Amino acid sequence: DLAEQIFSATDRLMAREGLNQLSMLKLAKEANVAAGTIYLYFKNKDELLEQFAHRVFSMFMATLEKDFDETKPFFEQYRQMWKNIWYFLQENPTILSNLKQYESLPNFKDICKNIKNCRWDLFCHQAQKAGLLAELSEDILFLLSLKTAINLASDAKFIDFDLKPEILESVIERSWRAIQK
Amino acid sequence: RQAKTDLAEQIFSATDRLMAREGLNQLSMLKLAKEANVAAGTIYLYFKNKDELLEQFAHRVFSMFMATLEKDFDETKPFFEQYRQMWKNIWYFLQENPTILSNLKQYESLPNFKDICKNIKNCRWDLFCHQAQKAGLLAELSEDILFLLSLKTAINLASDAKFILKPEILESVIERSWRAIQK
Ligand SMILES: [Cl-]
């Protein structure tokens, strides 16, 4: 509500000026609220940025869950998560531009590590258990595979893949190919 | 006679450091001269202002990347080994130069990491793709897509090594990222 307004303002301000240039006064300006109002919702910049990081990971998990179907073949589960990332990034240009900056958020590593049993980690376990995937760690598998969606995400490549979906399917299958046992 | 290139590199080296420790936004010429151990006069003579500095720095950054791809290149080896060399070149370069690794993200804000990049005459990657495609080895996908499916892993692994390792694992990634771009 007012919190998402402020988080959304954090993205924009983080995209337009650096993460280093954020202040509670500036964020209040950018969210079109008085300086007092922002402090009603967060005690300080650290807390705001902590909760912001948590909102970012919450979106990431949302994206991995959308139209999840465990009855489908593992490839089609993978294809679905790849497309969810793709289309999420198409729809959210400020988030796309800010992806690299999020790694500098103070709470980012500490939040990232403490997520047990997320949708990707479970997919890798099931898929390894069925004999499909390489016995490599889940991080390395991600980097060889779903990460290609983040790697490729740009405006010119949204246009190209929508015109030639053959290319998008090729990239999905090839990125899957990389993590086959 | 170019002690002028060496002095430029003295300043560029310092640009990296001040960019890695403080932000790119917080750069100013006074701060970069102190870091480089050059007089205020020297840096202002070399570069018209902060803009012209960061332009030339960009070009210098593209050059180091191109030189990294070229190191130990050998047409006579198989295309996989050429690719494996390039992977290792990137991996060990970024591990040896972590200050460069930090600034990778912030580099795209430089004028012009768009313009100066697309405009690269005879890039080793491009050339390699052409020879390997001509031989029949690689997917018929554009050179950037092929990169983003393959060598890109070297950069992503170095970068996320910090936020998340044995030699068999590195070879697995080299071989598997290669696998993604095979015809
Ligand atoms: Cl900054």
UniProtKB/Swiss-Prot annotation, chain A:
Residues 1-60 form the HTH tetR-type domain. It comes from the Bacteria. The keyword Transferase does not apply. Keywords: DNA-binding, Repeat, Transcription, Transcription regulation. GO terms for molecular function: DNA-binding transcription factor activity; transcription cis-regulatory region binding. GO terms for biological process: regulation of DNA-templated transcription. It holds the Pfam family TetR_HI_0893_C. The keyword Transcription applies. Residues 23-42 bind DNA. Disulfide bonds: none annotated. This is Uncharacterized HTH-type transcriptional regulator HI_0893. It comes from Haemophilus influenzae (strain ATCC 51907 / DSM 11121 / KW20 / Rd).
